[PDB]
Amino acid sequence: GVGISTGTFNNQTEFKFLENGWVEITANSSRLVHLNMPESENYKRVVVNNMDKTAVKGNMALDDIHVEIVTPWSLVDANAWGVWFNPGDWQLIVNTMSELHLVSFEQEIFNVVLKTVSESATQPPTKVYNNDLTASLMVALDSNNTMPFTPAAMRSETLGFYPWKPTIPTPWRYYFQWDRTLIPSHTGTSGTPTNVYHGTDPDDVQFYTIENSVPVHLLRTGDEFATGTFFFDCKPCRLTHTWQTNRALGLPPFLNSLPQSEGATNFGDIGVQQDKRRGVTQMGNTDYITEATIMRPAEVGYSAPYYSFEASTQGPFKTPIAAGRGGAQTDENQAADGDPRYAFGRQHGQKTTTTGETPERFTYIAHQDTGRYPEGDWIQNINFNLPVTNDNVLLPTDPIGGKTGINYTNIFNTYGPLTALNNVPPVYPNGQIWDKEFDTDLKPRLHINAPFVCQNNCPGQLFVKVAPNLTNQYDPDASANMSRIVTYSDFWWKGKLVFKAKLRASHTWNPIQQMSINVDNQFNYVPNNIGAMKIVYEKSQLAPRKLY
Amino acid sequence: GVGISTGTFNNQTEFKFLENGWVEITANSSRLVHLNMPESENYKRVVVNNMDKTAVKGNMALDDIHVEIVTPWSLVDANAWGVWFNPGDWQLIVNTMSELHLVSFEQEIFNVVLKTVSESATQPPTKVYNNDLTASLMVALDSNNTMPFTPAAMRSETLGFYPWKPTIPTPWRYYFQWDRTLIPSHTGTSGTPTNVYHGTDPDDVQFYTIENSVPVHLLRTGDEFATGTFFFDCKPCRLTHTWQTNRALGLPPFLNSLPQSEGATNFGDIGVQQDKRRGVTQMGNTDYITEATIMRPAEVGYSAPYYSFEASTQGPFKTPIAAGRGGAQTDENQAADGDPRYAFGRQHGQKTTTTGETPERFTYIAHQDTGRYPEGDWIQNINFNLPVTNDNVLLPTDPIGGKTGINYTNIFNTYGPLTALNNVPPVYPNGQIWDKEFDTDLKPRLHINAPFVCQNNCPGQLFVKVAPNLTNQYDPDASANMSRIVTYSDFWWKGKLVFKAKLRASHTWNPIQQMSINVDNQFNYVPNNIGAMKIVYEKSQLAPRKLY
Amino acid sequence: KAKLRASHTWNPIQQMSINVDNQFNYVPNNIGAMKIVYEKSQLAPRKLY
Ligand SMILES: [Ca+2]
Ligand SMILES: [Ca+2]
Ligand SMILES: [Ca+2]
Ligand SMILES: [Ca+2]
C-alpha cells in the first residue's frame, strides 16, 4: 500500500460556543517531522563532570555534573503553548475568556516515509536519495507512564511553532542516580573545598528500556498510527490577575476630611489620632491602629530565601519560589519572587533568519501583585516604641554573618497557615502546558513549570525511532558497530488538544487591559521580505479580579 | 494505487433542448496542468515602488506602487469564456439564444503525477526524470471565501483556451494595505510635486494564510479530488442589444408632406411651424417643440467625466464608466463611454507561433447604442433665444480652466433618477464570466468586468501546491533555505459549467445580424501548416431588441 | 444580533485596546469628571475581491 495517503493535515483552531458562556476550544496542529538514524544502537550510561569550572572557588552555582542514560530513541514532545495557538488565537483567549479547562489530548502519525542515502562517489561526488518501501519506522506510546517523565519544553526542545516549517524530535535521555559532593566557597576561600562525584548508589539504580516495557509498533509507508483520546484531570486555570495586597483588604478608614478642590495634592484626611482610633489589631502593646498595622484576614503572598541553594545526595540546587509581582513596574527583584526567564531560538520564536547560536530570551513578569519588595521589609523589637532606634531594628541594610551583601530578607521565610497564593500563569508561547504530579506521599501545592498538573493520570510519552536497516554484512559475534544502510524517515504528526473556556463579564465602569496590535508590535506578527518569522511572548492574565 | 486512473477527459459542450424554447448548455472542459515547486516556501510582504517613473512630472497615470503578499500557493482560475466554448459553440449561442442563465459550477482534479528531476551531471551533462510515487500535491478549496477574491482574467492569467495544449496555474498573490501620496503635475510644473509612499495603517493590516484558514488535501497518484456542485445566484444576461436613443422614443411627429418620388433626397415634411406644434416639453420658456426638444420618458445612458482620475488613501485610480456605443462606426470616443481593451497572448488567443513578448490586443466595441458623443454636446442659457450667441453657449470647444485641451464634457456628469442603462455585454474569449459582489453596505448597480455577479454566494477559489520534498539534510534552527529535492507535478483538471438559455423568436420582416464565416475570417478558425492557432474575439449581443 | 468573527490570516489584526495613553479617558478623576472619547468600529480587514 504505497500509493495511498493515510492522513490529513489540519492546523485549525475551532471555537465552539455553547450555552451559558462556555466555549469549547479545539486546537488542531499538524507538522512534518524529519527523523534520522540513531548515531548508536545501544543505551549508554554517560557521566557529565565539569569540575574544571567548579574547581574555581566561588563557582558552585555553575555545577553541571550528573549521570544520564542515553537512549537510541527520540521523543515527540508537543507540550508547549506555541505548538497549538498563534498570536491571533492567543489574543482571543486572553482578552475574552475568564478561565481555561484542559480537556483532552490525542495524536496520530501518518503518511510515513523512509529514504535511503546513496553516495554516488563520483566527481564532486554525488548523493542519491531513494525510497526504501519495505523499511519501517518504530513507534512506542508509553501509555502506562512506565518511563521517567521528561518535558522537552524545559529545554526548548518541543515541536516547532510554525505550521509551514518542518520540525524534528529530540533524542530521548534520562537521569541515572549518582552521589556528588560540592562544598561552597568564595574567591578568598583557602585550601581546596571538596568537589567529589562519588558515583551511584546500587539501591537507587533503575535502568529503563523501551523494548522491555512498552509494546513497539512498526510502520511502513502504508501504515499509520493513532493514539486514543486521553482525558485530563486538572483544576481550571484562571485568566485574570489579582492586584490586592494586604494593604488593600477590607474596609478603608473613614475620611473625616475630604479634599475640596481638584489637584493631585489635595488629599483626604482620616481625621483621627493614630492612637485614638477604633478597630482591631494583632499588636497587644501599642494603641496605634495604622493602615500598615491594622488587622487583615490572612496574608496574600509570602517571603522566601532568595538565591538560596540547597544540597542533597545529588548536589546543589536553587530553591524554587512561587510568586508574582510585588513592587513597582521597572522596580522588581527578579530573584525575590522568581520571575522566570526563557531561552530559546529560531524554531520556537527567535527571528528565523538569525545567525550564530546565542539564544533569544525574556524574563516573564506576571500582572498579579503577589510578590515582595525586600527593601521595604524591616523588623522591630517587641516594645515597639517609635521612632524606632537602630538597636531595635533589623533592616534589609544591616548585614548578616558580618557579610556586607547579605541581610535577613535573604534568609527570610514567612510562609504559614495564613498564606494566600495563586498558581503559575500560562506563558505564551514558550511555556509548558501540563505536568505530571510528583509521586511523593505529600504533594506540592503547585508546580512552578506549568499551570496544569494532571494528577491521577497524564498522556503517555511518544517515542519514535528508525528501525535498523542492515547491510549484507552483519556479525553479532564481533563488537564492531554493525554497518547499516544510511536511512532516514519523514512522517506527519497531528495532534488535537481540546480546551473548555468561560466567557468573561464586565463588572466595572472602567475599561480593561486588552491585548492589541500597536504601531510598535505590528511587525512582530508578520513575516519580512525574506520570509523571516519570530514569535514574541505575550502575557495571559491581563484583566483584574477582586481577591476579597 | 499507482496503476489505476482516477478520472476522465471531457471537453464536450452539450446542448439539451427542453420544453418551451429553453436549452440547458453543459460546457465540459478538461486540461492538463503542469505545476512547479514554489521558488520559496514562505509568504513574503513585498513593496513595489516605481518612483523613477512618477518622478517625471506629467506621468501620474503610470503609477504602479502597491504592496502585495506573495504566497507559495498557486491559483487555478477558469473564470473566462475562452476556457469553456470554442468559436463554434459561441456562434451557436450568440446567433440563436436571446438570454443566458449561469446555473452551476463544479471542478475536479485527477490522474495526479509528481516527478523528481535528477541532474546526471556527466558530460553535457544529463538530466533524469523519475516518479516519486509517495509524494503529494497539496489542494485547498476555499469554500467559505475566506481569502481575498482575485480573478485571473483581469491579468490574462486563466487556464489556457485549447483542449489539446497543456496549461499552468498562476502564483497566487494579494494586496496588502498601504498609504501613498502622489500629486498631479504637468511637464511645466515647478518644484517637486509630492510623491510619497507612507506605508501601512496598522488598522488595515490583514495577513492571510491558507494553512490557517482552509483545510488542505494531500493527493498522491492514487488520489483524486472533486469539488461539490456550486449553484449561482445571478440575474440573466441578455444576448441582444438596444439601438434606441432618446431621439427615437415614442410617437414620431406626423408628416403632413410625404415624398412623392423615389430618391434619397426626397424627404418627408412634418409640415408645421416648430412654434405652432402641439405636444409636451420640459422647457417652460419657448414654444419650440423639436425632435431634440420634445419630452421623453427618461434618459437612456448618461454622461460621466472622461480620463478622470480620483484619489484616496492608496493613490490615484481612473474613474470607471459603464457605457455602450453612442456615435458613428469609425466615430467613437473610446474614453467617453469606456470601451474595454484586452491585452493577452499565445495561451489565450494570440497566434501561437508568435515570437517576442508584445501582447496581442483589442478594444471591444459593443453594438448597444448607450454611449455618448461629447462633440455633439452643448449648453444654453435659460433664455433660450436662437440662434444662440457665443456668450450663452458652453461648447465642447470653449476651454475650461484656461486649458486648451479640457472642456466641460470632460468634467460633465448627467447621471440621475431618470437614467436608463444596461449591463456589460459578454466578451469572447478574453472576458471574465462571473464576479463576486462588493461587501459594501450599498452595492454598485453593475460590475464593469463581468456580466454575472454572484451576490449571495460564489464558488470558492482553488489553490494548488507541490508539498515540500525535503532532502536528508534539514535544520529548522538555521535560516538557510531548506534544500529540497527538485519536484514538479502534472495533473488533469476538469470543470463543468452549466448554463440555461432561451431560444429567440423573429419579430421583424427583415433578417438580422448573425455571426458567420467569411472569406476574410476563414483562416482565423483553423490551424496552419505549422499547427499555429489563435482565437479572434467575437461580439455577443448581435440582434436588436426594442427598448421602448 | 451579532456574528462572531473567524481568523483567516497568519497575521494578527487591529484590535481596540487600552494604552498608557488612553488609560485616563476611561476612568473618572479626583473630582468625578467624565468624558467619552470616540472610537472606530470596523477595525479588521475583509477581502473585497
Ligand atoms: Ca518582580
Ligand atoms: Ca500591578
Ligand atoms: Ca464608442
Ligand atoms: Ca449602432
UniProtKB/Swiss-Prot annotation, chains A, B:
Biological processes annotated in GO: clathrin-dependent endocytosis of virus by host cell; microtubule-dependent intracellular transport of viral material towards nucleus; symbiont entry into host cell via permeabilization of host membrane; viral penetration into host nucleus; virion attachment to host cell
Superkingdom of this protein's organism: Viruses
Cell compartments where the protein resides: Virion; Host nucleus
Major location (coarse): virion
Signal peptide: none
Domain notes: The N-terminus of VP1 is sequestered within the mature capsid. It contains a phospholipase A2-like region and nuclear localization signals that might be exposed by capsid modifications during virus entry.
Oligomeric form and interacting partners: Interacts with host TFRC.
Note: The capsids of autonomous parvoviruses expose a proportion of VP2 N-terminus and part of that sequence can be cleaved of to form VP3.
Family the UniProt entry places it in: Belongs to the parvoviridae capsid protein family.
Its job: Capsid protein self-assembles to form an icosahedral capsid with a T=1 symmetry, about 22 nm in diameter, and consisting of 60 copies of two size variants of the capsid proteins, VP1 and VP2, which differ by the presence of an N-terminal extension in the minor protein VP1. The capsid encapsulates the genomic ssDNA. Capsid proteins are responsible for the attachment to host cell receptors. This attachment induces virion internalization predominantly through clathrin-dependent endocytosis.
The protein's name in its UniProt record: Capsid protein VP1
Provenance organism: Feline panleukopenia virus (strain 193) (FPV)
Lineage, highest ranks first: Viruses, Monodnaviria, Shotokuvirae, Cossaviricota, Quintoviricetes
Residue numbers of the full-length protein present here: 180 to 727 of 727
